[PDB]
């Protein structure tokens, strides 16, 4: 205990003031195999669940908090603060610290802490109170030397791993919860950092709180700092009490722990069921059941404010990611340059009519690939954060839609500028200000509709691969339905209806009606089938398709769970 750091600050700067919280699990029988789990913890004690802390896809902490995607056959009771557990009570009193961190990398610690504070604290708290709460949270977890350092994860400089875990704990601790529950806090951390994090969690539990910790294989030094320990093997509790007396318990029942051996490891190795054989499976199950039998016989703020906070956080996060913005600008510039130089109109030989039609069709139908790719990548790169912030109750999935839309709007507009403005002059299209502005507006609206379609496809499907496949299928069905590939006339019932809702066909028709109308003539439009809808009608149809895709995306965000 003398090898680790000893010159620390044992002060408690952010304590929980209020009634002591309690958590009592009585005769829990969780299957699909927890059997006869029963304990009672109060505020001021740190409970560490050692052994097999999982039951398949959902850990024990998720079962206690009510979460879990697998089966939930229930046969017991869970009383939180003296009342039966419920999603409302869990969201109101219980805070959860997941194993995988979900933080925006382009934000400092103080910025994201203030954001979470103003999104969590009620609207009656003044700004000074919010800054004071943020400062108390920073001082409590010894994060004062990193209050201005980026919290960026790997692929970015950012800060350390233990400091990132402390930042996550502070984010989950800003609203001053009464019960904290962390699963695998020392996952992927060095030994000294894990020891310091365990000491910090013990101090937090001492600060009039109830801290539960999940640890599958705790180290020898981590086990020495445990206040209360719960040994679970094959879903059955074998021991429940003080860690320092744990060995003293087993020696009392004819199971001494030899010297120079981790007690936790020695006791999870002895009572573990062996799956390599079949005759030893029950041979160890009987010992586990007898030990379990001896153990049992021995004993605010609102919606507009949330939207503003979300859009400000998004703007501050994406406007500082220089590599991604530069990559997107490079893609836009490359596309524009190849499109304008392949169809270079300045020269002795001008562009033909079919050449101009193909140029417009390519301008319309070459962006969706990169657009959908980047949009789906960005959506699946932050799905866990959104899912957890929706489960914990930060926003009500309403302001998040408009926040995301108005956050991607400026960068999308810059991309559209870079892709479309230095392409209209290189190709030597119809000169003037009105046709160029109309072309730009139509391209902007079409790419916006494509972005909304990509967002809806990414939010509707659970995995990145199937979402990308469905989006590519939709894009290809809209591409083949265009007015340039299959003549827009050799379609019987289904492809015609697909073309009626295909934004690429409408974009091509609008560009044709902008370029070739009363130029040198509408007869080239008459030999084709691009003269049955006026320009404003095409714009309104594109706007309606964008609105329908927005409604679909909103319905998918509201009803479909964004499971990572």
């Amino acid at each position, epitope marked *: 205990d003398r090898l680790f750091s000893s010159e620390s600050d044992n*002060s*408690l700067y952010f304590t929980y003031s209020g009634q002591p919280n309690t958590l009592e699990v009585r005769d829990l029988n969780y299957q699909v195999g927890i059997q006869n789990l029963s304990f009672k913890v109060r505020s001021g004690q740190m409970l560490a669940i050692i052994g097999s802390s999982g039951c398949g896809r959902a850990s024990l902490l998720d079962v206690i908090t009510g979460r879990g995607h697998g089966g939930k056959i229930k046969s017991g009771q869970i009383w939180i603060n003296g009342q039966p557990s419920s999603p409302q009570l869990v969201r109101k009193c219980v805070a959860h610290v997941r194993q995988h961190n979900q933080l925006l990398p382009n934000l400092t610690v103080r910025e994201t802490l203030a954001f979470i504070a103003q999104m969590r604290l009620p609207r009656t708290f003044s700004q000074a109170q919010r800054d004071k709460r943020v400062e108390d949270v920073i*001082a409590e977890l010894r994060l*004062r*030397q990193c*209050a201005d*350092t980026r919290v960026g994860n790997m692929y970015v400089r950012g800060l350390s791993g233990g400091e990132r875990r402390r930042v996550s704990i502070g984010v989950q601790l800003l609203w001053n919860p009464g019960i904290l529950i962390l699963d695998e806090p020392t996952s992927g951390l060095d030994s000294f950092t894990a020891h310091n994090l365990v000491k910090t969690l013990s101090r937090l539990a001492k600060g*009039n709180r109830l801290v539960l910790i999940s640890l599958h294989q705790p180290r020898s030094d981590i086990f020495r700092l445990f206040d209360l320990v719960l040994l679970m093997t094959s879903g059955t509790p074998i021991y429940l009490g003080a860690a320092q007396h744990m060995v003293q318990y087993f020696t009392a029942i004819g199971y001494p722990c030899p010297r120079y051996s981790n007690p936790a490891d020695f006791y999870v190795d002895l009572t573990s069921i062996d799956r390599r054989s079949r005759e030893q499976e029950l041979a160890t199950r009987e010992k586990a059941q007898s030990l379990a039998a001896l153990f049992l016989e021995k004993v605010m703020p609102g919606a507009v404010q949330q939207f503003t906070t979300l859009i400000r956080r998004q703007i501050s996060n994406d406007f500082r990611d220089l590599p991604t913005l530069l990559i997107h600008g490079a893609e836009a510039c490359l596309m524009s340059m190849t499109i304008g130089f392949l169809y270079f109109g300045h020269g002795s030989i001008q562009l033909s009519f079919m050449d101009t039609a193909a140029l417009l069709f390519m301008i319309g139908a070459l962006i969706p690939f990169n657009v959908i790719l980047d949009v789906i990548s960005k959506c699946y790169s932050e799905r866990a954060m959104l899912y957890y912030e929706l489960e914990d109750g930060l926003y009500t999935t309403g302001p998040y839609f408009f926040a995301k839309i108005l956050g991607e709007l400026p960068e999308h507009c810059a991309y559209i500028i870079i892709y479309g403005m230095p392409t209209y002059w290189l190709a030597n299209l119809r000169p003037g200000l009105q046709p160029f502005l109309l072309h730009f507006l139509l391209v902007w609206l079409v790419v916006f509709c494509c972005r909304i379609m990509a967002l809806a496809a990414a939010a509707l499907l659970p995995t990145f691969h199937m979402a990308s496949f469905f989006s590519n299928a939709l894009y290809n069905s809209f591409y083949l339905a265009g007015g340039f590939m299959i003549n827009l006339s050799s379609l019987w019932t289904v492809p015609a209806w697909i073309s009626k809702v295909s934004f690429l066909r409408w974009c091509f028709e609008g560009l044709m009606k902008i370029q070739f109308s009363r130029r040198t003539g509408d007869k080239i439009l008459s030999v084709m089938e691009l003269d049955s809808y006026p320009l404003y009608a095409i714009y309104l149809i594109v706007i309606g398709l964008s609105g329908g895709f927005m409604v679909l995306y909103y319905v998918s965000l509201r009803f479909i769970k964004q499971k990572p």
Partner: antibody
């Protein structure tokens, strides 16, 4: 927020002394209480801290005086007490009574010579 | 964390704009405080968080930061500025102070 110190005087090396810091103007049982001395010709040096009731009135001292100095607080009259033992070897200073160390040293005292 | 204050001594008369610098050995993230000890002995915090000001102090005193060096700027010095000035950090335990500067008129 007024802090006044008393209890300074001439003491032979190896004896014992007790300084008293009287506090007024705020909740004495809610904020920290620090003793921070200054040598006659050097910079300010933090000596000891006594936390509030939320920490169950636990105390802490610097590595130079850890074991010889004992800080305590009387909440009835809101008076901080600092008992010093084996002093006057190098412990001669102008000890000051401050309110908050973690939130910036604000509302200092008047200091007493020992 | 060692706090090096500059200069150790300074002489400036009425009307001048004084600037006292303080460098920290490590990163304190702006958690620096400036105190003024009068010649009588009544110490009082002048600036907290290295940028904000306490209630009741004149607005002439200002705080700034350049790189890793914090600066206390006193514009339109008065006769009440002849005193000692100390910079301290409270971002990491233990709390250390600065060398101090004797501002003399």
């Amino acid at each position: 927020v007024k802090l006044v110190e008393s209890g300074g005087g001439l003491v032979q090396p190896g004896g014992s002394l007790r300084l008293s810091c009287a506090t007024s103007g705020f909740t004495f049982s809610e904020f920290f209480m620090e003793w921070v001395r200054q040598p006659p010709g050097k910079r300010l040096e933090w000596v000891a801290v006594s936390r509030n009731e939320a920490n169950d009135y636990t105390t802490d001292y610097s590595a130079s005086v850890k074991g010889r100095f004992i800080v305590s607080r009387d909440t009835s009259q809101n008076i901080l007490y600092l008992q010093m033992n084996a002093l006057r070897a190098e412990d001669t200073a102008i000890y000051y009574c401050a309110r908050d160390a973690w939130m910036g040293f604000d509302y200092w005292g008047q200091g007493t010579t020992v | 964390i060692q706090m090096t204050q500059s200069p150790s001594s300074l002489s400036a008369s009425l009307g001048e704009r004084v600037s006292l610098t303080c460098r920290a050995s490590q990163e304190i993230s702006g958690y620096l405080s400036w105190l003024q000890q009068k010649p009588d002995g009544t110490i009082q915090r002048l600036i907290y968080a290295a940028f904000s000001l306490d209630s009741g102090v004149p607005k002439r005193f200002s705080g700034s930061r350049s790189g890793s060096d914090y600066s206390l700027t006193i514009s339109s010095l008065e006769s009440e500025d002849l005193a000692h000035y100390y910079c301290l950090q409270y971002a990491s335990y233990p709390c250390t102070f600065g060398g101090g500067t004797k501002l003399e008129i």
